[PDB]
Design a protein around this nucleic acid. Structure first.
Lengths: 56, 159, 169, 168, 284
RNA sequence: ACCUAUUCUCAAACUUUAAAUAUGUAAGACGCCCUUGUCGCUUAAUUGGACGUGGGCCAUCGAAUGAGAGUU
RNA sequence: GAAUCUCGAGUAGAAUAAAAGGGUAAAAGUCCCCUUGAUUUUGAUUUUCAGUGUGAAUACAAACCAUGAAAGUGUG
RNA sequence: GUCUACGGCCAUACCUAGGCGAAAACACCAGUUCCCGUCCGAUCACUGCAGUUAAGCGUCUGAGGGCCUCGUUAGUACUAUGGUUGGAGACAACAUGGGAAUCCGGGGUGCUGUAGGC
């Protein structure tokens, strides 16, 4: 019972596939103080862009 | 049979260097780490708080979170047939900047510079590194360097 | 021409009474040190338990006091009358300090008390030069140079000149 | 368990250096294990033959194999080219020393070879180099060995030990 | 043999400053370690050191290359503003702390916003922030190796800097006159120490009791004939002169002349040829 | 019985030192430079920080080679 | 060298509850002073892993506090 | 150039014997009113400058111990790949690559950042 002979061959059969890399990650895993700040900054940035678009 | 403790078989990995024991250098705390920075994990045995697992010693990853006294590092760990993202909260005592990323950044600065003067002069600039080319043809002068003839030496008994 | 500030001076005189036992006798010895020194003695406890002396660890067994300054010089002189200004060359340690023990204390001007009894104790004179703060201070502590350290012969000579005493070889 | 061999130096072990210039080595040619018991037997054989032929004071025999590896008993792990025995003698006892080691080859397993060393006795210098340095005074005997001059150390600490040394 | 070659080979030396006994890295770590999520925000430290005759008060930021000084003042600058004597006492520490605070705020740009306590009455106060303005310049004290006992000159420098407009978080547990039993601060005693009354009391009692100690212990004061009672007004005038003009003046010293003077006295190291010449000349 | 300079010979749980082979990452357009906005976080402070805006350089686009690739 | 304490050296050769290894010298060691961060509430990670559970652990966040002149440290 | 404060790397900086140090600075130092702590102001705390470079400190010397580099060891030990290679085995050689360590000898005995003082 137990051996590791075939497992590496079985592993590379379908490659050692990397996880998909996305542009934005979740603001989870981040500091709660930082995360709530970024909400307020992003909320104001969205408002600022919309007002600038409306006035231009 | 094994014992599967967190610090098992870390006798030599977490050991302090010879004549490098004692107080930790203070410059470690004065370096700023930002998200996206490349850092090399090297566990310091003196600080037993915030230690990563013995797998992450010698691994390099990208910082994703910066905390009061710690850094969040993103490592990819081989689990069977895939890569898994491992997010290790490791204190800055066990973290150092990767000189490779610096060197890349300085090379990027140089490449942008060479591109600027190339466009200013109207010429094209070679920016891609090349592997070492085969040796070129060159002359070798024997003046005051007359070749000496060598013969293999006979066997001798010298213990 | 010798620099005047390296003149040898007395640092401290330590009076130690070790009876090998605890209780009222040690307390009375503490009072004796109180009258002799005018200072509160400190009780020395046992580091280890020894059966041959009947000593158990952590028991207050001894009382010691440290006198420094002019009072130390006077008490040292008082002991020198008892010793008749005679000390063997063996009495001087290589560091530069010396000492002597006195069995009987009533001759030191202490009134005899039958309830107190007779206690034997050790004088110990520690010798220094002006500049020992360099080794005894916290900030910028350092090692005293070899040329400034004190030898047994240096202490012997200083003792002989100051007190006109004879040191047996 | 106690090793069967306890004495590793035999003969005139207190002899100097200059009177015994010749050195002959019995070296193992094969990577093998040699039991302590076999080492003791060869030691007895070599000592008996050398004393019988050349006498007690005409040789110094040193066993360089030490049985530290354990297998009940101990064996001496030897490599290719590792010296097993070394005999230092005068130039006249060359045949006696060679015959003594050749007979003791039969007590050892594997292949053993007899080589006359180019070094002076048990020293690390060749015979010509040792003679030159002895003449120049950088070598002073000390019991069964000799102290050699070295550049390091205090000048007084080396001059008092080597008084007749002629520094250039 | 107690010190052998293996002993020296295995010997690991402490840091240079720890060998010299000048810094405590255990306290330095916690003083200079800035939070990593604050990135490049510097952590300013009020380093206060005392010699046998002078006070050195500095404001220091920590960097990888080394420590940088933002503002500085030396107690030898007090005679410029009036204080000539007791350049290392509690009052001098207060004055230097006030001078450092004024210089730092002038460099920062907060002198006109945070004047601090113009007239020190001994009350324990902290520099409150402006509601719609910049917060006070935050500095943390560094005592070094001096013990933190009540009535220390280090806390005197802290009090001077705090009154100068800097924000140094602290408690009155170390200010002179603080009673441990009642947990109260004696403002009268603190004002007395601020104005140097603890020296005036020393002078008058010495005159009353043992004048022989007086002429030699207070020789500097007696040389100019200044008695105890006007110390308070002298210090008050010194504080006013410090506040009106806190600028630091550089001495017109001739650095090149000092270089020429010292190069004569510095010893030049012998080369290899000189070493071997001295070598064989002694062997012969 | 030591101490000093030596000397003979060893170590799986001894070691100052320390390979070979295997091993982590980087080698850019999610790039670079400049300008500029948001925030309740952060700083002594539009100071930072993070996300942005508007521009500018622009497939020798920043090593060699080879393949289309990935996920349910 | 004095009828236990005294100063010279002292790279840790001692201690750190318990096995063993790692870590530690103006300390993590030995004394002293004040203390209950051995507390409440989240989520996020690490290890053994199926990245299920359990156990142990790490870095935060919102409170409430201890301590210290303070920086800061503390969720056994 | 020298000194002080704060440091960075943390012995080329450490340990030891000896010889120097002009200025300033630093240190030794006098005292115990007070703040403060001890058996003892000796340590720590506070006030001051009467003398001193004796020590700390800086510097020099020693074919000093040590430490750091360069070479010797050495293409040696070892090792990745290869053979229907040798050898009973042990092991060894060869082909294509990587390549140390001690001993030994030469050199070296801190450099440097900010703010100042002479």
């Amino acid at each position: 019972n137990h051996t590791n002979h075939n497992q590496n061959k079985k592993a590379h059969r379908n490659g050692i596939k990397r996880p998909q890399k996305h542009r934005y990650d979740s603001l989870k895993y981040r500091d709660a103080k930082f995360r709530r700040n970024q909400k307020f900054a992003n909320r104001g940035t969205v408002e600022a862009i919309r007002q600038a678009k409306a006035s231009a | 049979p094994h014992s599967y403790g967190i610090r098992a078989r870390t006798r030599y990995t977490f050991q302090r260097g010879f004549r490098e024991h004692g107080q930790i250098r203070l410059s470690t705390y004065l370096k700023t780490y930002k998200v996206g920075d490349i850092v090399d994990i090297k566990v310091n045995g003196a600080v037993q708080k915030g230690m990563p697992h013995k797998y992450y010693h010698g691994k390099t990853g990208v910082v994703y979170n910066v905390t009061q006294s710690s850094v969040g590092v993103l490592i990819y760990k081989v689990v069977g047939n895939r890569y898994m993202e491992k997010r290790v909260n490791v204190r800055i005592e066990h973290v150092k900047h990767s000189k490779c990323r610096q060197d890349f950044l300085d090379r990027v600065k140089a490449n942008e510079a060479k591109r600027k003067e190339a466009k200013a002069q109207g010429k094209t600039v070679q920016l891609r590194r090349q592997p070492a080319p085969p040796a070129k043809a060159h002359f070798v002068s024997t003046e005051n360097n007359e070749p000496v003839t060598l013969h293999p030496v006979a066997y001798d008994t010298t213990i | 021409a010798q620099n005047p500030m390296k003149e040898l001076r007395i640092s401290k005189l330590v009076l130690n009474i070790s009876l090998g036992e605890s209780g009222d006798r040690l307390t009375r010895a503490a009072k004796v040190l109180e009258q002799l020194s005018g200072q509160t003695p400190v009780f020395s406890k046992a580091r280890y338990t020894i059966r041959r002396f009947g000593i158990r660890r952590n028991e207050k067994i001894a009382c010691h006091v440290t006198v420094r300054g002019p009072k130390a010089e006077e008490i040292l002189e008082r002991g020198l009358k008892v010793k008749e200004y005679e000390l063997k060359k063996r009495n001087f340690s290589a560091t530069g300090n010396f000492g002597f023990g006195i069995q009987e204390h009533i001759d030191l001007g202490i009134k005899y008390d039958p309830s107190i009894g007779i206690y034997g104790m050790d004088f110990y004179v520690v010798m220094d030069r002006p500049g020992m703060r360099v080794a005894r201070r916290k900030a910028q502590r350092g090692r005293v140079g070899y040329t400034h350290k004190i030898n047994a012969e240096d202490t012997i000579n200083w003792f002989k000149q100051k007190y006109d005493a004879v040191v047996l070889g | 368990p106690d090793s069967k061999i306890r004495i590793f130096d035999l003969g005139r072990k207190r002899a100097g250096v200059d009177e015994f210039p010749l050195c002959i080595h019995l070296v193992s040619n094969e990577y093998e294990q040699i039991t302590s018991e076999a080492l003791e037997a060869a030691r007895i054989c070599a000592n008996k033959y050398l004393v019988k032929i050349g006498g007690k004071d005409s040789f110094h025999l040193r066993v360089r194999a030490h049985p530290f590896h354990v297998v009940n008993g101990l064996v001496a792990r030897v490599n290719i080219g590792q010296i097993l025995m070394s005999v230092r003698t005068k130039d006249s006892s060359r045949a006696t020393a060679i015959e003594a080691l050749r007979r003791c080859q039969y007590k050892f397993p594997g292949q053993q070879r007899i080589i006359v060393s180019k070094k002076w006795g048990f020293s690390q210098y060749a015979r010509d180099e040792y003679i030159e340095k002895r003449s120049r005074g950088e070598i002073i005997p000390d019991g069964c060995y000799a102290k050699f001059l070295n550049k390091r150390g205090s000048l007084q600490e080396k001059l008092d030990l080597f008084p007749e040394a002629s520094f250039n | 043999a107690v010190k052998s070659s293996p002993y020296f080979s295995r010997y690991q030396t402490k840091y240079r400053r720890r060998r010299e006994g000048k810094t405590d890295y255990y306290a330095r770590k916690r003083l200079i370690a800035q939070a990593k999520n604050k990135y490049n925000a510097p952590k300013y430290r009020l380093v206060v050191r005392f010699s046998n005759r002078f006070v050195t008060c500095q404001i220091v930021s920590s960097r990888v290359n080394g420590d940088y000084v933002l503002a500085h003042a030396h107690s030898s600058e007090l005679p410029r503003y009036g204080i000539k004597w007791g350049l290392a006492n509690w009052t001098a520490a207060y004055a230097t702390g006030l001078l450092v605070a004024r210089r730092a705020l002038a460099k920062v740009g907060l002198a006109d916003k945070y004047e601090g306590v113009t007239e020190p009455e001994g009350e324990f106060e902290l520099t409150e922030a402006i509601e719609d303005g910049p917060r006070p310049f935050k500095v943390f004290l560094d005592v070094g190796l001096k013990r933190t006992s009540t009535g220390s000159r280090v806390f005197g420098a802290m009090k001077g800097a705090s009154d100068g407009g800097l924000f140094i978080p602290h408690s009155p547990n170390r200010f002179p006159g603080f009673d441990i039993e009642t947990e109260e601060l004696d403002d009268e005693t603190l004002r007395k120490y601020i104005y140097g009354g603890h020296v005036a009391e020393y002078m008058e009692m010495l005159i009353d009791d043992d004048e022989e100690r007086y002429q030699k212990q207070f020789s500097g004061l007696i040389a100019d004939g200044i008695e105890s009672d006007q110390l308070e007004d002298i210090y008050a005038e010194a504080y006013a002169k410090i506040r009106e003009d806190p600028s630091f003046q550089k001495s017109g010293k001739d650095a090149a002349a000092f270089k020429a003077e010292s190069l004569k006295h510095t010893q030049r190291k012998l080369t290899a040829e000189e070493r071997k010449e001295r070598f064989n000349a002694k062997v012969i």
